Each structure stands twice: as structure tokens, then as C-alpha cells.
Amino acid sequence: MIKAFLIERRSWIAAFLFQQALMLFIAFVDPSISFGNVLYMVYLCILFFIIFLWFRYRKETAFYKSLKTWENNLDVTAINEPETPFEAMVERSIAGQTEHLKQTAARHRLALENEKDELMAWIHEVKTPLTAMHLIIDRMEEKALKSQLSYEWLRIHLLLDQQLHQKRISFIENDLSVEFIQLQPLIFKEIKDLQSWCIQKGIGFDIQLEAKEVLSDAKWLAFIIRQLLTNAVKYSEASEIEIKSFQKGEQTQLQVKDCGRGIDPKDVPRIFDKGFTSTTDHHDQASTGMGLYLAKKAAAPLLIHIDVESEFGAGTVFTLTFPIRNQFEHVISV
Amino acid sequence: MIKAFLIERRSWIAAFLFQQALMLFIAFVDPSISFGNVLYMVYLCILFFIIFLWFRYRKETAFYKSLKTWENNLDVTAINEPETPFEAMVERSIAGQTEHLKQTAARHRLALENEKDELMAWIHEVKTPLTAMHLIIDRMEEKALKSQLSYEWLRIHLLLDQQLHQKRISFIENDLSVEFIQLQPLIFKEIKDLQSWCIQKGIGFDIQLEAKEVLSDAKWLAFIIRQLLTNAVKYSEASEIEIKSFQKGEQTQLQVKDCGRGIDPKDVPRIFDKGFTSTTDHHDQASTGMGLYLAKKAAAPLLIHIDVESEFGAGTVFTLTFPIRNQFEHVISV
Amino acid sequence: ILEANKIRKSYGNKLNKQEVLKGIDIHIEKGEFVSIMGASGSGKTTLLNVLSSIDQVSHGTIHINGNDMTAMKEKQLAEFRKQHLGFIFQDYNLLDTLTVKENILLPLSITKLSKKEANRKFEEVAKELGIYELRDKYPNEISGGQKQRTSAGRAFIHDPSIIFADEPTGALDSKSASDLLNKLSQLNQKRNATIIMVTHDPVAASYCGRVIFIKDGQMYTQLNKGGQDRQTFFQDIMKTQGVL
Amino acid sequence: ILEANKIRKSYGNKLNKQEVLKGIDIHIEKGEFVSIMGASGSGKTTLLNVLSSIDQVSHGTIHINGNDMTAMKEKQLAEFRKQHLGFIFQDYNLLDTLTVKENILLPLSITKLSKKEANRKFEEVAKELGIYELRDKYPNEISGGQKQRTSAGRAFIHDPSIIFADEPTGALDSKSASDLLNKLSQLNQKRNATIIMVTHDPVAASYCGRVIFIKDGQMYTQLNKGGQDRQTFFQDIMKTQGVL
Amino acid sequence: MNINQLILRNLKKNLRNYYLYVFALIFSVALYFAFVTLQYDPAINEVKASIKGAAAIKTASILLVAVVAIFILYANTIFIKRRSKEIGLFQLIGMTKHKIFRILSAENVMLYFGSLAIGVAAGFSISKLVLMILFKIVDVKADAKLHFSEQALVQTVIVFCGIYLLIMIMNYTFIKKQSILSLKKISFFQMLIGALGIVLILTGYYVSSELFGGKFKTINELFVAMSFILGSVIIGTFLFYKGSVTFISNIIRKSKGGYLNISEVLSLSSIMFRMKSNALLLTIITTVSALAIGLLSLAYISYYSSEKTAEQNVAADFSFMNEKDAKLFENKLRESNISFVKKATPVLQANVDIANIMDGTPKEMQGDPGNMQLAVVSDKDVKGVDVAAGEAVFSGYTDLLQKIMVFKDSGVIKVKSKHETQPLKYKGLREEFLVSYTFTSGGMPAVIVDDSLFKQLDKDKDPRIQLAQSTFIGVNVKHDDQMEKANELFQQVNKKNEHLSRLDTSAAQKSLFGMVMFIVGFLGLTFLITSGCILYFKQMGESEDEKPSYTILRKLGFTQGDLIKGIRIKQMYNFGIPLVVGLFHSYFAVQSGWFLFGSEVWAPMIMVMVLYTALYSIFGFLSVLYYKKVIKSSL
Ligand SMILES: CCCCCCCC/C=C/CCCCCCCC(=O)O[C@H](COC(=O)CCCCCCCCCCCCCCC)COP(=O)(O)OCCN
Ligand SMILES: CCCCCCCC/C=C\CCCCCCCC(=O)O
Ligand SMILES: CCCCCCCC/C=C\CCCCCCCC(=O)O
């Protein structure tokens, strides 16, 4: 910063040099003043001025280098504390702009909180009507039209549950609760929830649970089981779903099998991708293609591995590998 | 700021004074050099230095005071273009900070607009199955069950319409379309839309419209009229709603009157507030209480005055004052 | 007298965000001896720090004696912290070169109360804490259970509005701990002075009137005692701690 | 590891002579955190000088892992202590002209080890002591606790067996002292290393597992803790220090 | 770890901390080079006085080098004791004792030799300013030239190489002596010590008040009082610091009660704790400062009154004792276009007894009281007074003799004639002088008698005590004109230089005392710049050994704006207490023998004390700067 400092202060230096130049020049018009002595004076002034300039340089060219230090890389606190009054105001302005940015960030956070609160308000104001509609629907007599109405109600109820679980996958971290789960009551509850779809599509359930106890999150395990059963029912017609749970080693596994169309091998690794919809059938457009992705995302913290084995024209096999009991102590204690 | 400048540049003044003292001393101790010329030079140079200090003060004080006016004001251009490299560095740093703030704010706004669009798409994909159930269910035979189902469907559709217009109230100005509207067909359509509730509650309608043609926007006016009729139906039991539209001077007045429980005079000014719910009866808890607020907010861009005249135990009269045709000339042209 | 709503502190290294306060709301009536206790990884220490002026608030507001002090300013905050809010640190913090009377009278020397008023105030304070016979001893000659009493007397002399005690009886034996707690309770009973105290020892907090169980930056219920003996409240506190 | 048996130091300056130590017997095993507490004027510092091989001995047999410090020369003894011992002092001795990394890596610069192993050792030590983020700061701009933690970590870079440590709490407040003692206790459990603290502060000594009280010949009492909860042991050590 | 990097970083740290040491080295080297260049200049021979002129600069150089050597050695033994933790740690790490020596000796030779090389180059630059300063105190109209004088280079290099060798030998022993270790209430003794110190100092002053005048009436008794006073003052100064400060501070502390603010806390704690430890240092500083100030003030007092003493010593502008030489000088003045006034008055050397007139003691012997030599003149030749019979009037004032021999009012004077004695009385004392010092012994006044009485006294004319010439032919000059031409004419009149002029004596006195003033002033400046640095380093250590206190205080509510305010008063007291004692010593040294030198005081002392105080204060402020630097980093 030699050149920058010199350009910054090129008036005071000119003042002093003009002083000494005038002192030398008044030596040629006055016979009462010699030349060597005046040269000596100018020599003892040049030396002093040079030393003073160097010291003032090395003191003063620090803050404006700290400013360039802070500009882009890192170290928000790089700027040195002001010592002269002039730098104090620059520091105050920068700090004021920074705190203004922080206040804007806080206001944006408040706006996001308000929007999310209105989102849950709408969620509850929509979730009450579904219960009211179910209560009203459970009063009718005819077969076909009532079955269609129940199918529509179950479709909307499942869609709203998927949306609520998608909203809750952000806060699953603070809502996890691991305990012993009995597979048979959960499977019966899922079957009862999906009764209308199975009745309309003529799909039965084969319950063979060798293992009856599992260790995971009951709510999310029920979510995954319900999603798998819904997918199997939708993608299969006039087929029986075989649900088998067996203990392999020290880890429990649950298998759901359907005799539906199956998944093409080229799209099997991409079934769990977010928003994925198969182009094989036009009816897949109605499917949101979000249940598998949410189930995989929620199963990862639960130490459950999801495997898919699908052959076209044969069916699809889904297996969930429950974690060992000892692996949850590290989660409860920490 | 005189003191703040004379304290910041004390070193140069001290150095100048010391140089003058050195010159005087060396001139004194030497017999060759006289001792009047140096004194006269000292006096003249001191006065010139005073003028030079004033001149230097002016520029830097002006620029820095401009910068300090910039930091806390509503003028972003209050910073002058830098003339010396240090001010260039300061301006560059401030410009970089402003660029970062602008980038992050733009990213935040674009993101939030993205979730808003996704939410709107979800709302559409949720309201479509309501039409699906309407199409499926407009075939019922039993009178009471069909009436109850129609009442529930109408309530849900009214909730969805209120939510849709709450979403569109941020762009209502971009949806305005001035055209001549026949009030009678619109009122008949609104009455036929609320047929189920009136059939259930035995509510009749009296239609006496002296004025038939108005100038406004179809969608928002229809929404406001539907909300007013829905509130009148909900707050009335086994009463006939009379709608009167007559021309008063140069402004069209539309009156909505019902023979329900009315509105308490203390609560009359507060109905227009967002989310207001009457505490007289617990049946109003399920009501959002935002339809009146949405209607009032939509009436302002339409230049329509909303009047309220209610009596406790008698009924509520809702009056809408349409603006003059010539008052739309200034809005349409712009 | 204290009133805070939706307080939130984010302590991070500008690379990792780990909030520790989740919008704590607390109300304290003047003349109450409340306590804050619970767990070891919570932010109760940070909560006590942020209630005072030692640390700012990232999101929220706090009111002391009605006077809002949330906008804050260094020269104003320092004056407010000096003119009120007596403190009792965990450490003794006694200047060794000075005697027991100079340490007590030093905070009052930036007000110029002449000499008679200062002597009268010191007489009144020292008559109640039982340290009047130690007007000339040095801190390196008295027992470890009397320096804490001297610090408490220092904190109580300029009659502040709210007194923040941060683990007072943490490094003392049972006898001196009980003596100091009894002295604190008597001083609170006689002259109206709110004390907010953070303790890890249940029998130390048994002398209180209210207890707040901060857990993971949340509220997790509150106790109130009331018209009950110290023993039953002690057992209830122990049971509540055992539940957590 | 070490065995104290009839350890005595000779004297005889001018005419007046005193024998501070009059019989020393300790038999301790690896993975211990013994605190040789005592009383003022009992020559505990002299016990450090004799035990740490800093001061030459005259009587008694001491075996450091089966090696007697009287069985080799002064240069060999210096090499033995520099390759098998580590020290922590009351006041940290940190050069200002170096960094927090170079300060810790200075002991293992003369041995001429390859850079990668030294970097790995510093990485693991700094991560397990919590100062890795302060990797290249200067000791001018760090807190009081971090300087002492760096000094402690310096004595762990060359993997010694016995960690001599004078009072590491002289110029620290309660929070920093508790943090440092917690870190030392965590260090003891992970890697087998004997720590012999010598302090006269019950708060610091309550973190140990064995306390030895020296009156004149280190035979007064011997507490053992066993299954306490860091508070009953605190009261026990207070009572033992107060009975005499 | 690339030891060179460690050495470089240590040197960079050392430069920014001890900069006063570097400034002192450069100043000392420059001044020594300037004196050695000035000594060998052939133009120095224009300084003509009793002392040669080129043999005093040698003494000044020898005096200067010892002061510089002592200061350098003490500073370098202060510095090494602040590096003991580092040495202990390096010995624990595994380095030998022959590598620490190199590590902390290679970062010092570069600094020392850089200072030595820079100082020489700024010493050839001030070698003419020193000449011009010298040729203005002694009035000489010569010219000064700029040259190098290569002998000064050799002398300076050799001297400072020897000093550095001593430094290195001193450093090595300390390193080869270190061990691997090192890594309230007032008694009844301090009260007695303080009381004894104050009493001894006061007694020294009171005894010093008499000296020249009264008792001690010989040469082997005065040199006893001088030794007693010097010893008493030095011992009292030493005992003042050990006990007499603690007593006063303790009284002040246990007089406030229990109400103390921040300033009193800091000041009392610092002074009471630390002022006792440095007792030998402060004594040396105070005594040497007093000595320098007193000597300079006395030299200035003597040099100030040269004009008046030269005008008093010779009554007229010229004085002549031979008629042939006087007529020769008037002959040379005849054709010089300069007119003169000549006047002659006979003088009688007669002895009388005035033993009854002094108000002091008869023991002030200084000759036989009945045989004092006095000058007797008539009244007709005197144009100022008209005396009568039996009345005697004196001449001159001579402030010196008034204190030695006080004069009472009118009495009786017995004339010690051959065979008669006419009593007279003392009428009054005049102030002007009428006879040169040749005829009036040392400074004894002259009597005035009536013409009729003179006509009998000159008739007597006892020839036993008469001088060579009993006549006062002394020529005057007209109003201000070219006196210098008449001056060299007078110079060439007397090849034996036996007469007296009114300018040569003044010039000789001015030169003789101007040289002394020059030398003493420069040595005093060097001592001031030397002592300031030592005090600064001691205060640096004291400030670094108190940082915890500031941290504790900064937790109860106090801000830096109050800590610095207290530090101001602390530094004021710490740097002011050693100064007032020195000022008192010097002031009581000056006002006991001032009449032996000049006739006017209060002009020099104020100027000298003001200069000394200003320089001492500019050394004082930097300590406050260092304290401000330390306080900030004690959060
Ligand atoms: C004749 C009457 C004398 C009265 C007493 C006057 C003495 C008062 C003044 C001395 C002025 C000194 C001015 C410099 C002070 C600046 C302090 C400072 O920080 O200097 C630091 C450097 O310090 C130095 O280098 C000082 C070395 C020379 C000291 C000044 C002396 C210059 C020559 C002496 C004059 C020679 C002629 C004397 C004849 C009158 C700057 O920071 P850094 O070390 O570069 O950064 C560290 C890198 N990590
Ligand atoms: C006699 C010729 C000149 C001799 C060399 C000059 C001696 C050193 C003088 C001053 C050095 C510059 C001072 C440093 C700048 C800071 C001063 C300030 O801030 O007030
Ligand atoms: C007769 C001449 C008198 C000269 C007076 C000199 C005035 C003071 C001179 C220079 C002071 C320089 C102060 C620089 C020290 C910086 C402080 C620091 O950072 O350590």
C-alpha cells in the first residue's frame, strides 16, 4: 500500500517540500545568508521528515488493510477496532448494516412461522371434515354406489395422511418414540383401514406372523405398512397379499407379497426417487409417487433397510429389516 | 466536527511545529544566517498553514459527513463517488455487502414463492376430488340423507371457495375486469347454490331487484355476494331472506337482510376484523369468521361501500353501495 | 417484576446452529424466592445469564421493573447493570490487598454518599449477617464459609431490585451452607428483595417458595409449595427430580 | 507403577538442618488418579521435587516401571524422564511467538518424526480435548481455560506413562476448573495413564478415586471412595481435612 | 522447527517492546562520536582560558563512557531475568545448555550491531552542530567545517566491542547457573527506620545551612562538616525509601476509615508494595540528579555575572600603574582619532583597628583585626561626597564580604599611625567602587577622609606597608564607540601584560565557566535519558505483575474509563516522588554557597528545573500508554 498511501497524502508532503524549497531559493537573493549552512538545515529537516513519514505509514496503513481482509473470504470479525475517530464511524456503519440484515432475517423467520401456523390451521380445518364425512357415510345401505363412495373417501383420507406425514417428516426428529410393537394388531388395523379397496378389488390377506414382536417407531412402522399395503392393493387385481414375518438372526424381517403387475427392472432402482411415476400405465398419473420416498426417508433413522425384488408378470416382494434391540440404547441415552 | 478533525491530524501539526522550531534554533546558533528573515518566514508560513488546514478540513469533513448521513437515512445515493483510494475501498466493501444482502433476499423470496406455488397446486389437487364426490353423489334417493350430504358438501365447498379467494386476494388487482353484470341471474345462481341449506332449515327467498345492471368485476362481486348470503343463512333459522337493490342518486345500493338472530351492536364494528367469531353461541367456534373480512377487503379495490345495520333479536341488514360508472373511467384508463 | 416472552439464544460458530432456548416465558412476582434447577446439559445457566444484562437476546424481549431493556446499548446497559442487579458469583471474588470492610464499601464509592451514610449502611448490613466482628481482618485469615457471607453482604448493600444468585452454596460444608441459606431467607423475609437462584442441591433449593424445572430448553411443569412444611416440600422435590 | 519405599532427601545447608520427609510408602497401579493432598508447611512441593526426579535423592528405592532412577547417570536420567514422563504446572508456560499447534508439537520436533504421524497425533489430541477449532490462533487471544487445556495437551503428545501435575487450578475460576478436571478424567479412562495430582483444594480432589493425607510422614489417613456420587466423597474429604 | 524462524520472530517481538533501549544506544553512540570528533579538530584551539580546551573533552569522554557502560550492563541484566520460564521449558524439552546460549544470543548481536552501525551514521551528521553550539557559549567568531575524523570510528568500535564482550560473558554465567526448577502488618522496626530517616535528612539540611560563616573557622574543620553533611544526607535518603514511605502511607490508609475508591486502592497498593524493593536504585538516581542540577546551576550563576564582576574589579575601563606606559598608550591614542579622559588619585596603604565594628564574632580571624589593610584617600579628589573631620565613609558593597564580615552602625576607629592615633567614626557605607583590586587587598573597602585630615595622614606616610606604586592613573573612554581597536592598542602597549583592561578578564571568565557549563549540561542530559529507561522497565514489570487485579475489578461493574483514570494518578505518584526529593536536595545545595560565585540568584534555578521537569514528564507519559495497552487485554 505504498502507492495508495502516497496518493492519499500528496498535499502535506508537497507543503513541507515547498517550505524547504522556498528556504533554499531565498539563498540566491540575499547576500546576508550563506548557502552551505542553509543546505545543512534542509538536510536535518529532510532526515527528520523521512523518518516521521515512515513511522506514520506503518501506523496508519492497518485498518484499510483489515477492511480488504474482511471483504470476501471469511472472518466477519477481521476488522480491527478503531483508534482514530474517523474509522469509528465506518465501523459503526458496517455494524449497523449487519444488524439491519439480522433484523430482516428475524422478520423473515417470523413470517415463515406465521405461514406455517396458517398451514396447520388449514390442515386441521380440512381434517375435521374427513372424520365428519366418514361418520355420515357409515349409515348407508346400498352396495355399489356406497362402495364407490367409500373408495373415494379412503383415497382422500390416505392422500391427506400422506400430506400430513410429509409435513411431519421435517420434525420426526423431535417426535420419535421407540417401543415394543405387536405386528398382528398393526396389520389388522391397516387391513381395517384399507377394507373398502380390498373389497372392491377382491384382494385378500394372508397373515402368517412367525415373529410377533418388533422394535421400531410404531407410528412410522404403521405408516410404512399401510403404504406398502395400499401400493400392493392398487397395483394388483384379484390377488391375495401374503404378509409373512420371520426372524433372521437377531433382526426381525417383515415381508409383503403381491401378485400384481410388478415393476420393470429398468425402473426398479428408481422407485424410491421423489416424485417418480411409472409411464407403463396411464393410471399411474393419479399416483403421487411420494409414499415410497417418504417411507425410505423415515426408515433410515430407524436403522431399517428397505429391499425390493420385482419381476414383471410375477409380483413384487418388499422386506423391512428391523434393527437389533441393543442399537436403540445409543438413541435413548443420547 | 472541528474537534474530531483536529484530534485526528495532531501528528502532522506537531511535526510541522517541530520543524519550524528546528529551523529557528539552527538559524539562531549560527552567526552567518541572520535572525529576522527566518522569523518573518516563520510568521508567513504559519498563516499560510492555517489557510491550508481550513482548505483541507472542508473536503474531508464534507465527504465523511455525507457518508454518515448515508448510513442512517432513506437515501442510498447519499454516498459520494470516492476520490481517494481509501474511500474507494470503503465503498467497494459496502457495495459487496449490499450485493450479498440483495442476493440472499432474492433467493429467499423466490424460494417462498416456490412453496406458495406448490401449496396452490396441492389445494387444486385437493379441491378436484370434492367435485369428484359431487358428481358421484348427485344420484341419491333418500330425501333426508341426500339433504344432509348436500349440506355437508356445500359447507366444504364454501370453505374451499373462501380459501381460494383468500389466496387470490393478493392478486385481486390483477384479476379485475370491468364489465356490465346482470344482478338477477347472479343472485339466482347464488340462491340455487345455497338450496340445500335453505331446504334443510326451511329458508325462503324474496327477490325484488329494482336495479338490474351494475358495473363491477364478476368473480369478486359474486364471491362477496355468496359470502354474505352464506353468513345470512348460517346466522338465521327458519327465516326468509329479502334482497333489495335500488338506485339511490348516482350510486347503486344493494341490500341483504335476514330475519335471524342478528348481530350485537357492540360486535357490529368488529365483524369486519379478520377471524372474528361471535362468543354468544359455541356453534360459531367451527366458523372461521373470515368471510366478512375477505368481502370487505375485496370491496375496496372495487370502490364499493359496505354498510351494516343490525338489531339484536331482529336481524342484520347488509348494504353494498356500488360506485358510479364515471368513477371507473380513471381506473380503466390507468 | 420480571417478564420475558419467547426468548431464544442461538450459540454457534457461524457454521453450526444449535439453539438452546425454545421460547421460555416466565413471570416472577416481587418478593418471591424462586429457584431454577434440572438436568446438566440444559441451558439454565444460559437462561440466568440472559435474564441479566451479561448476555443479549437473539430473539425475544425482557422487561425489568417495567423499564424495557431489550433494545439495549453498551453505555446504557453498563449503567443499568451498575445501578441495579446485584450479583453473587460462584467464586468469592475478593480483593486480597483490602480488608473485609473495604470490599463491602467499594461498590458504593462511585456515588459519593459522604461518610456517615456509608457507615450507617454498613452497620445495618453487617449487624444481620454476623460479620461485624471482622471489620479489619484480611481475606487470607478468615474461614472459607465467611468469605461467601462477605460477598453476599456486598451484593445486598446497595438495595438493588433483583438479585441474581448463581450457585452460592456450591463449595461449602453442610453447616455453613445451612447457615448461609438461613441468613439469605431471613434477609429476603425482612426487606422485600427478589432472589433468583440456580442450584444443583435439592436441600439447598428446599428453602425456596417456587421451583422451575428447566428441561431441554422447555418448561416441564412448575411447583408452588405454599402452606407446607419444609420436609414435605423437600420430599416432593426429590420425587419430582427422580421422575426426570 | 512407581514404588515409594523409605524415600528420604538429604540436607545440611550451613548448620541448621531439617528433614521434611520421614518415611514414604506408596504402592499404586496403572489407571489411577491419586491426589496426594496435605497441609501447608508439610513440604508437598518437596515431595514433587523428590518424586518427579527433578531433585536428586539420597535414600530409598523408587522403581519407575521396574527402573530405578539411581541406576543410571544424570544424562540417562534426563533422557528417561523426557521420554517417559509428562508435567503440568500451576502457571502455564506457553511461548507467545508460536501458535497453538506449534506449542503442542514442539516437544516432538527434536526426535525427528515424520510429519504425518505428528499431524495425526495433534489431530486426535485436539479433537479429544476440544481445541481443534483453535488450530492456528495465538495464545494472546484465547481464554484462561484454553491456555491451561493446551498446556495439559502438550504433556500428552509423546504418550507417557505417569502424568505429574502440580495444582492445575491456581488461576482458574470454577467453570474452567470443572471443565479441565472433566477432560482429565475422560483422558484417564480412554488410554491407560497414571495421574498424580497434588493440590490442597477439596473441590479438585473430589474428582479422584484415592486420597492420601500427609501430616508429617504421609500416614494420617487414606480414603478410597469406591462407590460414592462425588458429593458424599466431598463431605468425607472435608471432614477428614477438618478433623486435624 | 527451523530455529531461524524462532530467532527472527523473537527479534521482531523484542524490537516493538524495548524501543527505548534502542533509542538510548543510538543517542549514546552519536554523542560519543561527536565528542571524539570535536576533540581532534584543530579548530578547538581558539578556546583560550586557564584550562587548555582540548584536555577537558578527554575527561568528558572518559566520564561519559563509564555511565554508558553501567547503564548497558544493568539493562541487559534486567532483560535476561524475564526469560527464565523459557529457559526452564527448553531444559525440560531436551536441549542442552550450549544451544540455549546460541538461540538467545544470536537474536541480540543483530540488534546490538544494528544500533551500533546506525548510531555512527547519525554521529557524522551532528558533529558540526556540536561545534556551532560550543562556539556560542564561549564568544568566538571562527568557522566550523564538516569532516569525518576516522580516529573516532576506531575508538567507538573498540569501546563498544569491549562492552558487548562483557555483556556476553555476563550472560553465559547466568545460563550455566540455572536449575531445572523455578518453572500485612506494621512492626516496631519500620516506624523507627522512618523516623530516623526524616530526622537525619532534616539535620543534614540544618547543618548545611551554616557552613561558610560562623563556626568551622579553618581548613581541617570545614572538611569535617562537608563529610558529615554528605554522609547524613545520603543515609537519610536511603532510609527514606525503606521505611518512611510505608509509615506515611499506613497513616493515610488508617485515617480514611473504610471508605476507599478505585484511585486510592490502586495508588496505595502499588506504592506500599513496590517502593520498598527498589531502595538502592532510587537513592542513586536521586543523589546523582541533585548533583547534576546543582553543579549546572552553580556554573550558570558564575557565568551570569561576569560583566558586573569585571566592571567591579577594575574601577575604570583601563588601569595603569606606570607613567611611561600610560603616556605611550595616550600617544598611540592621540593619532587614532579617539579622545580619552585621564584621572589620577594618590592612595595610602595604612592599617587600622576595626575590631569593634563587626556584628559577628572576633574569632573570624582572617588577618589581625588590629592590622587589617585598608586604602586611605582624600575627599578633594572624590567628586561625590563632602565629609567632615572625625568622620569616615567606606566604598563599595561586595555582597560576599557582608555575610563573612557583618558591619554595625557608627563606632570608633583607631588609626594605627607611627606615634599617634586620631579616633574617627563610621558614617556610612556606599555602593560604588573607586579603586582597582590591586590596592585594596582582596576586596576590603576603602576609607574616605577630609582633605585637612589627609594633609596630615600623607605627612605621616609610614613606609612599612606601602605598595610598589601609590597612584591610580586610570584612563577612561568616551561614549560607546569602537572599543575593540583601543583594546588591541592596549594589548600591544604591554608586552609583559602587566596592566589591566575591562574586557580580557570578562572574556577569560566567560570562557572558563562556559566550558564547564557545556560539559555538565551534556552529561546531565545523558544521565536523564539513561534513568528514564530504567524506571520505564521497572514499571513495565510492575504492570505485568498486577494484570489479575484489573480482571477481578472488571467483573463488578467498573469500565476501562475508570481503570485508566486511576492509573493516571498511580503513575503520577510513582514518577513524581523520586523527583521532588532531588529538587529539594539541589535547592538546598545551591542556596548555601551562591554568594561565592555571583550576585543574583532565582534566574538560573527556575530555568534548569523547568527543563529537567519537562524531560522527566515526557518520559513519564509512555508508562501510562503501556498500562492502557495492558488493561485492554484483561477481560
Ligand atoms: C534529545 C531529547 C530526547 C528526549 C526523549 C525522546 C524519546 C521519546 C521517543 C522515541 C520515539 C520513538 C518513535 C517510534 C515509536 C513507535 C512504537 C512502535 O511500535 O515501533 C515499532 C518498531 O519499533 C522500532 O523499530 C524503533 C527502533 C528505533 C527507535 C526510534 C529511534 C530512531 C533513531 C533515533 C534518533 C537518532 C538521532 C537522535 C539524535 C537526537 C513498530 O512496530 P513493529 O515492530 O514494526 O511491528 C512488529 C512486527 N510484528
Ligand atoms: C536531528 C535530526 C533528526 C533525528 C531523527 C529524529 C528522531 C526521531 C523523531 C521522531 C520519530 C517519529 C515519531 C513517530 C511518529 C509518532 C509520533 C506521534 O504520533 O505523535
Ligand atoms: C526537545 C524535544 C522534545 C521531544 C518530545 C518528543 C515527544 C514524544 C515523542 C514520540 C512519542 C512516540 C510514541 C509512540 C509509542 C507508541 C506506543 C506503542 O504502541 O507502544
Numbering used by the authors:
A (entry chain E), B (entry chain D): 1 to 334
C (entry chain B), D (entry chain C): 3 to 246
E (entry chain A): 1 to 183, 195 to 646
Article excerpt on this structure:
One such mechanism widely found across Firmicute bacteria involves antimicrobial peptide sensing and resistance membrane protein complexes collectively known as Bce modules. These modules are composed minimally of an ATP-binding cassette (ABC) transporter which defends against antimicrobial peptides without transport across the membrane, and an interacting two-component system containing a sensor histidine kinase and response regulator. In this module bceA encodes the ATPase domains, bceB encodes the membrane-spanning permease domain of the ABC transporter BceAB, and bceS encodes the histidine kinase that phosphorylates the response regulator encoded by bceR. Previous studies have established that BceAB mediates resistance against bacitracin, likely by freeing bacitracin from the lipid target undecaprenyl-pyrophosphate (UPP). To understand this critical membrane protein interaction and the molecular details underpinning the Bce module flux-sensing mechanism, we have determined the cryo-EM structure of the complete BceAB-S complex from B. subtilis in nucleotide-free and ATPγS-bound states.
